[PDB]
Amino acid sequence: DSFVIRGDEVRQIAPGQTGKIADYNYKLPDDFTGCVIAWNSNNLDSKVGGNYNYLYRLFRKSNLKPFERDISTEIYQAGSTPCNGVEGFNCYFPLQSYGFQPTNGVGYQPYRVVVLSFELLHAPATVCGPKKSTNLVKNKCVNFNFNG
């Protein structure tokens, strides 16, 4: 799962964490088994004048389930007045764009974070780790292990 997040909210993508991104954009389960990887990308995702190509869901009626997407663009009705598909009082847009400038300090710079989720089911294991191989030896009493 690859996506761009702000620097001051990188630790929100973790089992047992809250906030604005961990509740309305992307939430990890409490029993998540995997590794979180993130790196700074200020040299690519930042441009002079403001990089407004990345957005985030700021307002939502409820929290997201673990591993759930939400591409809805409905106007968030924050009050009792029904929003007629237009913005205004108690009617705000759920998606807000990030401000990525090259002069931002640590915390506000774009940080590309990827999530590697490991799943184990009844199906046979297809992805494993690289099995190392050693050199051969002849005319010596040596234990061997080829496949099993």
Partner: protein, 595 residues
């Protein structure tokens, strides 16, 4: 569904949009100040207009939210700070007239020239001529002529402008549910909704008057000493009983008495602590100065500076091809970016100024952990106090000899100590009675206790009774002398200086007591004191989210400002002045006049 949830949603939307908008506006302002041209000015003007329009729209949108139904202190404070519809409650014509009055007063104060009566072909300007004459000149007639010209050529032109400005400000304050414009200014010190930490508006005046009455003896002794010293340079111009003249205070308005150090020096045989030579022989630079300041701040217990602060700030003059303003200012971009604009040269004064700016940046980074409406100090005098305490702790001889500027074999003589204490007095406490008198005069002229035909009369009465300053020549109702100051002719408060003067000494005493240091307060160092650093960061983190009384109680242990630290800071100087004023007459009499 509730109003609180809608208010929180609106506050989140504001903290999302206004953050980026103010960041762009600050970037434009930085590009304009660091590079003066015809495009940067237009960009900054467009950014400022957009920011003002956005603030107006957000205020008009937030005005539809009741303030009595909110139970959260943070949301209530943010709504109160956002719904400040000051310049919009009046009519359009009245607002345009007030803006025109402000602009014409600013142009009169800035573009104000005065020509000599004998040389009409060459006139004198404020900054190059008037300040130079009031500072480095000693002739009585020349200073008197300069003061009279400054009070006549500019004071008389601002009389109807000020008469209309005070009325417009009173009307604006009454439209905003206030008593007067002075009440509107004091409302910044008002905090409600917290049990025990409440602070009314008249309580500020009462505390200021109490602190002034408690500090009056020290200022009286200092004024007596200054008068006794000036009687030598002026044998038949100043009386040993009357007050000091207005044009013999080393300042155009008599605010700062720093320029009188060359005449009121206690011991002229020993020079002041000046490490300029020791700084230029060791091959120093502005970069090394900022590195040493960062080392001091990280030894106190504060985090380092951001990488952007070192890779984006202009700590040195760019040259003659690029023009920039050489005024030390602290820039808070908002999105984790912090820079300093200062033409830092190799000088001890520049060293203290860099320490002050770095303290400002540290306070900015400390309160940056709060929303945009709360990203500010607890009051209008906390930032300057946090800067000045660092500037004073960096100017101590112990810190200078620990850095490497001062030689370790240099002994601490009491004559240099008395000279430094007298300099600090003349540069800090010399403006406190003037500040109090000006603030009280403005409060009484905004409330309406002073009739329009007695403004300057009561002004001079207070300046002769409260302060030890008497006017040389009589000025009638056409010489608007109070309006000759920058802070009064540009709609700026003045009690903030007294508040920060109290707060700096309070913070110094608190951090010195927390550092387990004994001896005098002026020779106290908090460089290697992590406890004081943590105790100060506990107050810098609150910012504007918590009331200023709670911040004070957290940093010094009291919810009210006190002048006792100021008296304890100058206790040896007080004893020396009392010992040197055995034969001199302490005090002043209001019956004497140079007429």
């Amino acid at each position: 569904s509730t109003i609180e949830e809608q208010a929180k949603t609106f506050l989140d939307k504001f903290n999302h949009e206004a953050e980026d908008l103010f960041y762009q506006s600050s970037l434009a302002s930085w590009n304009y100040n660091t590079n003066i041209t015809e495009e940067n000015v237009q960009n900054m003007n467009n950014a400022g207009d957009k920011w003002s329009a956005f603030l107006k729209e957000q205020s008009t949108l937030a005005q539809m939210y009741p303030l009595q139904e909110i139970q959260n202190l943070t949301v209530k404070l943010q709504l109160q700070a956002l719904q400040q519809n000051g310049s919009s409650v009046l009519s359009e014509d009245k607002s345009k007239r007030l803006n025109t009055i402000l602009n014409t007063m600013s142009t009169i104060y800035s573009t104000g020239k005065v020509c000599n009566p004998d040389n009409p072909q060459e006139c004198l300007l404020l900054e190059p001529g008037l300040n130079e004459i009031m500072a480095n000149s000693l002739d009585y007639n020349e200073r008197l002529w300069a003061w009279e010209s400054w009070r006549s050529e500019v004071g008389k032109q601002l009389r109807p402008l000020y008469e209309e400005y005070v009325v417009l400000k009173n009307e604006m304050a009454r439209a905003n549910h206030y008593e007067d414009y002075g009440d509107y200014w004091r409302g910044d010190y008002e905090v409600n909704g917290v049990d025990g930490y409440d602070y009314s508006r008249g309580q500020l005046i009462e505390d200021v008057e109490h602190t002034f009455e408690e500090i009056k003896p020290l200022y009286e002794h200092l004024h007596a000493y200054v008068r006794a010293k000036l009687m030598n340079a002026y044998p038949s111009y100043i009386s040993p009983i009357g007050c000091l003249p207005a044009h013999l205070l080393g300042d155009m308005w008599g605010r700062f008495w720093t320029n009188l150090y060359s005449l009121t020096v206690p011991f002229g045989q020993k020079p002041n602590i000046d490490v300029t030579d020791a700084m230029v022989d060791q091959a120093w630079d502005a970069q090394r100065i900022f590195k040493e300041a960062e080392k001091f701040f990280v030894s106190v217990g504060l985090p380092n500076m951001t990488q952007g602060f070192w890779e984006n700030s202009m700590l040195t003059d760019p040259g003659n091809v690029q023009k920039a303003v050489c005024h030390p200012t602290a820039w808070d971009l908002g999105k984790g970016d912090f820079r300093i604009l200062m033409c830092t040269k190799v000088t001890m004064d520049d060293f203290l100024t860099a320490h002050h700016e770095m303290g400002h940046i540290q306070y900015d980074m400390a309160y940056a952990a709060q929303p945009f409406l709360l990203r500010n100090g607890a009051n209008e005098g906390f930032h300057e106090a946090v800067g000045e305490i660092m500037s004073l702790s960096a100017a101590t001889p112990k810190h200078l000899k620990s850095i490497g500027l001062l030689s370790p074999d240099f002994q601490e003589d009491n004559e240099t100590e008395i000279n430094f204490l007298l300099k600090q007095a003349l540069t800090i406490v010399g403006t406190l009675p003037f500040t109090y008198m000006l603030e009280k005069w403005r409060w009484m002229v905004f409330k309406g206790e002073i009739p329009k035909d007695q403004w300057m009369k009561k002004w001079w009465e207070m300046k002769r009774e409260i302060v030890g300053v008497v006017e040389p020549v009589p000025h009638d109702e056409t010489y608007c002398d109070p309006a000759s100051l920058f802070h009064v002719s540009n709609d700026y408060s003045f009690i903030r200086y007294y508040t920060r003067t109290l707060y700096q000494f309070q913070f110094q005493e608190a951090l010195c007591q927390a550092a387990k240091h004994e001896g005098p307060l002026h020779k106290c160092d908090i460089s290697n004191s992590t406890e004081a650093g943590q105790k100060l960061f506990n107050m810098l983190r609150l910012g504007k989210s918590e009331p200023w009384t709670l911040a004070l109680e957290n940093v010094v242990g009291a919810k009210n400002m006190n002048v006792r630290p100021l008296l304890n800071y100058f206790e040896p100087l007080f004893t020396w002045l009392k010992d040197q004023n055995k034969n001199s007459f302490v005090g002043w009499s209001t019956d004497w006049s140079p007429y």
